[PDB]
Design a protein around this ligand. Structure first.
Ligand SMILES: O=c1ccn([C@@H]2O[C@H](COP(=O)(O)OP(=O)(O)O)[C@@H](O)[C@H]2O)c(=O)[nH]1
Ligand SMILES: [Mn+2]
Length: 207
């Protein structure tokens, strides 16, 4: 059972729904003994592409706070822990036993517009330096175009690490609410992907 550090972050901080997912994630980490890293630093770069790339920088903050981590888990600020599954461990939903694997990722077919969705991303500690390269690419075309870091993992990173990544079904660990409404109830991680700040606020009030 590996050492897991869950990390997240959101600019601006005082956004309501981001505070609400954070607490559900913090509670989740305390139940299972996972480390929780939440970025508190305001970003030097506030442009959309830069905020989307920021996860590649926060993982390094997480790495320095929690050096013993085996797997870093990025969850978007609009991803929360399903309260019905909050007492279930991540290792009940995914097999993290193949030592050759650097990334566990998730697809969003047939409803999504990209082959992977990096709103929930598992990064092995040995891929830390790769993530540093992903961050260093934030201002270069084409990687500074939508969909940014997600495109950079799929189109830059994955071709350079053949056989060292896995794309899983998203049903329990990256369950997009609008696309898989029927799975939401048995998901661990539920993603309010591609909705507005007010829409996400309202949804989190309901949870
Ligand atoms: O206004 C924003 C939007 C983006 N993000 C960061 O970028 C990630 C992805 O944003 P979002 O979930 O809105 O993208 P989507 O899933 O909707 O494509 C979030 O976890 C945030 O850390 C942010 O800090 N502020
Ligand atoms: Mn998201």
């Amino acid at each position: 059972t590996p050492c897991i550090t869950i990390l997240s972050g959101h600019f601006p901080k005082e956004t309501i729904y981001a505070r609400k997912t954070k607490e559900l994630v913090e509670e989740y980490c305390s139940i299972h003994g996972y480390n929780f890293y939440y970025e508190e630093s305001e970003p030097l770069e506030t442009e959309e592409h830069a905020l989307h790339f920021r996860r590649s920088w926060i993982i390094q903050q997480a790495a320095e706070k929690f050096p013993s981590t085996e797997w870093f888990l990025w969850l978007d600020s609009d991803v929360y822990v399903n309260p019905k599954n909050k007492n279930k461990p991540i290792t009940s939903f995914i097999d993290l036993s193949d030592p050759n694997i650097l990334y566990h990722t998730f697809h969003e077919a047939p409803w999504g517009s990209y082959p992977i969705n990096t709103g929930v991303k598992f990064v092995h500690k040995d891929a830390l330096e790769i993530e540093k390269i992903v961050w260093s690419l934030r201002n270069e075309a084409p990687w500074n175009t939508f969909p940014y870091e997600q495109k950079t993992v799929y189109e830059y990173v994955f071709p350079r690490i053949p056989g060292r990544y896995i794309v899983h079904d998203p049903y329990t660990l990256n369950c997009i609410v609008k696309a898989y409404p029927e799975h939401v109830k048995d998901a661990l991680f539920v993603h309010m992907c591609g909705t507005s700040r007010a829409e996400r606020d309202e949804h989190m009030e309901m949870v």
